[PDB]
């Protein structure tokens, strides 16, 4: 919901995509993660996690807080007026108004 | 390049040919019948090779060639971010397709490059495809 | 390196040219020096060069200094600008900028 009210003018195809940048931006860090477990230097049985650590279970909050960075609306304020006014060119129930039968 | 099977053969009979025809000194008009000499005492050397590849042999090939580069990544140096950005796009949905299942994020279907002519364009998505074995 | 950053504005296509501009100013001296070597006059076996000189078994330096001389840029500051404006009309992350997640 602050996700909601925060980005005002953006079209359905552009917060989709956020939705997946924030999921790139995590899996490069779940990638890279198991980069240095792996590559522990003296990798000894000694104190070996036995267990799956799981460093990214799941999208945590700043994988947001730094994909919205890269956000950018795709419709202008410019383009928005062209339907606007082609629905000013339908004439949109303007003329006489209201009138009522006689008694 | 080019070459097939068959071209390689005729490759191989002509420059026999050729290593035989620099040899008529001793394959003679007077000696009718060849001695055993020359039969088994002949090798064919680099330049005769060179000469049956250059003089003859035009090449049945016009297609496409499917192939693995063999360019590196320290070929053309620099440009870190690109590296990052294609082995983020090419190489992690194949080499980890189940880290990419665990969320479901779908991989992308291509990039497209643009900049000034001849900055080693093809150079770079070469490397790439050399980097993950790909053709 | 002192060839490095010399050439500043060149494109990959350009600095790719000058090895081998650079090849063949040495193989126009590479033939000539065989000329005179075949055409010495009164050509004696006295004080004969059993050995081949090889005036020029390697590029040297100055067919570097002056293959250099015909170096142009190919690509101009002009449409580079063009780059810049297209890489200008991609967004580029702008708009609202940092905001943070409430607490």
Chains 1, 3 share one sequence.
């Not at chain 1, 953006?10 to 995509?17: K, N, Q, R, V």
């Not at chain 2, 064919?44 to 035009?58: E, G, H, I, K």
């Not at chain 2, 090449?59 to 063999?70: D, G, K, M």
């Amino acid at each position: 919901e602050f996700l909601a009210k925060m980005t005002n003018g953006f079209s359905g195809a552009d917060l989709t995509e956020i939705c997946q940048r924030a999921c790139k931006l995590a899996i490069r860090e779940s990638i890279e993660s198991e980069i240095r477990r792996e590559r522990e230097r003296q990798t000894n049985p000694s104190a070996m996690e036995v267990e799956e650590d799981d460093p990214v279970p799941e999208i945590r909050r700043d994988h947001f807080e730094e994909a919205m960075r890269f956000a950018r609306r795709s419709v202008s304020d410019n383009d928005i007026r062209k339907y606007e006014m082609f629905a000013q060119t339908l004439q949109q129930s303007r003329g006489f108004g209201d009138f009522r039968f006689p008694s | 390049h080019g070459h097939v099977g068959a071209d390689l053969a005729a490759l191989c009979s002509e420059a026999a040919l050729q290593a035989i025809r620099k040899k008529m000194d001793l394959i003679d008009l007077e000696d009718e019948t060849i001695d055993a000499e020359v039969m088994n005492s002949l090798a064919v050397t680099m330049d005769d090779f060179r000469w049956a590849l250059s003089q003859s042999n035009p090449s049945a090939l016009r297609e496409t060639v499917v192939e693995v580069p063999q360019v590196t990544w320290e070929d053309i140096g620099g440009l870190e971010d690109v590296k990052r950005e294609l082995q983020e796009l090419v190489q992690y949905p194949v080499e980890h397709p189940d880290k990419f299942l665990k969320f479901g994020m779908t991989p992308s279907k291509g990039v497209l490059f643009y900049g000034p002519p001849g900055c080693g364009k093809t150079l770079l998505a070469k490397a790439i495809a050399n980097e993950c074995q790909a053709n």
